[PDB]
Amino acid sequence: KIELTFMFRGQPQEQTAYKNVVKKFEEKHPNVKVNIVVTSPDQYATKLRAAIAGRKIPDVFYFNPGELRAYVNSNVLLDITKYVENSKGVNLQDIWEKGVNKYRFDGEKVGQGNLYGLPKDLGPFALGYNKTMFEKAGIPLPDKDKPYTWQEFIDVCKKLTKDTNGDGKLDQWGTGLNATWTLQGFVWSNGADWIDESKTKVTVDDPKFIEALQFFADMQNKYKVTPSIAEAQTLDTYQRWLRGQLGFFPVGPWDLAAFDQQIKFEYDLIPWPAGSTGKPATWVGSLGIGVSSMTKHPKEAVELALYLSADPEGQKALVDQRVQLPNSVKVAEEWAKDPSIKPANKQEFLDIINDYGHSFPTEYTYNGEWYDEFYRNLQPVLDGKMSAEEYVKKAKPKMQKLLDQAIEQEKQASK
């Protein structure tokens, strides 16, 4: 009888995981058929915006929490409050509250009110270290609790940076962080942010922001605890991490499957290094699972979303397949305490969610074009061809205009 379109994004391992779980779902609901539309993480936002622009919207789909408000105003998302209430036994309250609450909207704020999506997951971005090269080097292991200072972090990265096969060429580096996904921690840890408290002013020219930005770039260009620009060009640092060439690199729970398959060294999680604030910082990501407000099959569509987001047996298969941590708080707590399941300090993930993880800036803004503009022309700063001070001075009014326009578009689309 019922056919359903499901679009989402994922790295190869994530795609395989969700397809198997949709197949479990179909077995449990033999009158529902799910046609899948899946993309790479990169190509995803463009395709969804084209589907929405043409009002050819999938029954069920992934979406950015920072688009909730705009999606609601434009009538993109079905209000699913009652379909989830009347579901069998499902207890959304067992799910992470910061997760579920990203997809609530009472007409004026995102804190409370009706449900317009379910959280796919929470994605704490932890720091990982290669325990195998640390030991082989004779370097004391990092503290599981007490974060490196920036200076300390650079020191160890230096000791980890060397020519190990004695051919005269460096073949191992302390680290190689990707600014797109790892600059936030340093900014936030240094007491800065992309925007102010009100979330209406751009603050990337705060001296604290500049200092963190400069420190990030300097680890490739000045401290040289990084493969060179050319070397990174030859093989990106993600890949070099997988190959065992890097001391440190981030780890999200969506990595665990890929890492099971490729990483041969022992590795574990630690807090991110801390800037002036003394406190570690990093992000906790999330994607929403929403339902087309114009789906012909709201009941069944909500049923597919619930199965992926909260259903005990649907959650279980996704965690088994190592592409996320459990959405149920209590389950994740016993998951984090289970020693048979690597890495050892899985607990760090939860620590990031409860204590020292933050949201992306765009989650507070009506759209994120202002933020995308910061990263669009950032590469010359990363490659040392201009300072952090002069890029952010040049780029701040560009991104204040975009932010002003986003605030204006939310007045206009919501009245």
Ligand X SMILES: OC[C@@H]1O[C@@H](OC[C@@H]2O[C@@H](OC[C@@H]3O[C@@H](OC[C@@H]4O[C@@H](OC[C@@H]5O[C@@H](OC[C@@H]6O[C@@H](O)[C@H](O)[C@H]6O)[C@H](O)[C@H]5O)[C@H](O)[C@H]4O)[C@H](O)[C@H]3O)[C@H](O)[C@H]2O)[C@H](O)[C@H]1O
Binding residues for Ca(2+): 163, 165, 167, 169, 171
Give whichever of 98 and 131 is closer to ligand X, judged by the CB atom.
Answer: 98
By CB under 6 A, name the one of 180, 198, 340, 412 that touches ligand X: 180
- φ, ψ of residue 383 to 5 degrees: the values are -100, 5
Say which entry of Ca ion, ligand X, none residue 271 contacts (CB below 5 to 8 A, set by partner kind). none
By CB under 6 A, name the one of 142, 147, 191, 250 that touches ligand X: 250
Give whichever of 123 and 147 is closer to ligand X, judged by the CB atom.
Answer: 123
For residue 242, give the 3-state DSSP assignment: helix
User: Using the rule CB under 5 A, is 171 a contact of Ca ion?
Assistant: yes
| Cβ(384)–Cβ(413) below 8 Å | no
Cα 322–324–329 angle (5° rounding)?
A: 120
By CB under 6 A, name the one of 110, 116, 117, 121 that touches ligand X: 121
| Cβ(328)–Cβ(95) below 8 Å | yes
Q: Residue 163 CB, nearest distance to Ca ion (Å)?
A: 4
Give whichever of 235 and 413 is closer to Ca ion, judged by the CB atom.
Answer: 235
Place of tokens 């975009």: 402
Say which entry of Ca ion, ligand X, none residue 171 contacts (CB below 5 to 8 A, set by partner kind). Ca ion
Cα–Cα distance, 310 to 307 (Å, whole number): 6
- Among the residue ranges 138-146, 159-167, 283-291, 339-347, the one whose residues contact ligand X (CB under 6 A): 283-291
Question: Considering CB under 6 A, how many residues would be counted as binding ligand X?
Answer: 23
By Cβ distance, which residue is nearest to ligand X?
Answer: 285
Interaction with ligand X in 31-50: which residues (CB under 6 A)?
41
Cα–Cα distance, 15 to 143 (Å, whole number): 35
Cα–Cα distance, 290 to 300 (Å, whole number): 13
By CB under 6 A, name the one of 247, 252, 326, 361 that touches ligand X: 252
DSSP 67: G
Q: Which residues are annotated as a binding site?
A: 163, 165, 167, 169, 171
Contacts of 319 (CB under 8 A, 6+ apart): 325, 326, 331, 335
User: Using the rule CB under 6 A, is 285 a contact of ligand X?
Assistant: yes
User: Using the rule CB under 6 A, is 286 a contact of ligand X?
Assistant: yes
| Cβ(337)–Cβ(345) below 8 Å | no
- Among the residue ranges 26-34, 162-170, 316-324, 330-338, the one whose residues contact Ca ion (CB under 5 A): 162-170
User: Using the rule CB under 6 A, is 59 a contact of ligand X?
Assistant: no
**Is cis: bond before 343, omega within 30 of 0?**
yes
Give whichever of 165 and 233 is closer to Ca ion, judged by the CB atom.
Answer: 165
- Ranges of H-type helices in 196-328: 207-221, 229-234, 237-243, 256-262, 298-309, 312-320
Range 193-199, long-range pairs (CB < 8 A, 24+ positions): 193/361, 194/361, 194/371, 194/374, 195/361, 195/364, 195/365, 195/403, 199/361, 199/364, 199/365
Q: Residue 243 CB, nearest distance to Ca ion (Å)?
A: 13
**230 burial via Cβ count (<10 Å: 0-12, 13-18, 19+):** exposed
Cα–Cα distance, 142 to 269 (Å, whole number): 9
By CB under 6 A, name the one of 242, 287, 305, 310 that touches ligand X: 287
User: Using the rule CB under 6 A, is 65 a contact of ligand X?
Assistant: yes
By CB under 6 A, name the one of 254, 307, 356, 366 that touches ligand X: 254
Q: What are the Cα distances from residue 339, in Å, to 3, 258, 309, 336?
A: 42, 20, 25, 8
By CB under 5 A, name the one of 3, 85, 163, 320 that touches Ca ion: 163
By CB under 5 A, name the one of 42, 167, 197, 338 that touches Ca ion: 167
In this structure, the dihedral spanned by the alpha carbons of residues 169, 174, 179 and 180, taken in order and rounded to 10 degrees, is: 100
Q: Are strands 114-115 and 60-63 parallel, antiparallel or unpaired?
A: unpaired
Say which entry of Ca ion, ligand X, none residue 368 contacts (CB below 5 to 8 A, set by partner kind). none
| Cβ(335)–Cβ(99) below 8 Å | no
Give the x/- contact pattern for ligand X in 143-172, rule: CB under 6 A: ------------------------------
Give the x/- contact pattern for ligand X in 187-226, rule: CB under 6 A: ----------------------------------------
- Among the residue ranges 21-29, 175-183, 184-192, 268-276, the one whose residues contact ligand X (CB under 6 A): 175-183
Q: Which residues bind Ca ion (CB under 5 A)?
A: 163, 165, 167, 169, 171
Q: Which residues bind ligand X (CB under 6 A)?
A: 11, 41, 64-66, 120-121, 123, 178, 180-181, 236-238, 250, 252, 254-255, 285-287, 360, 363
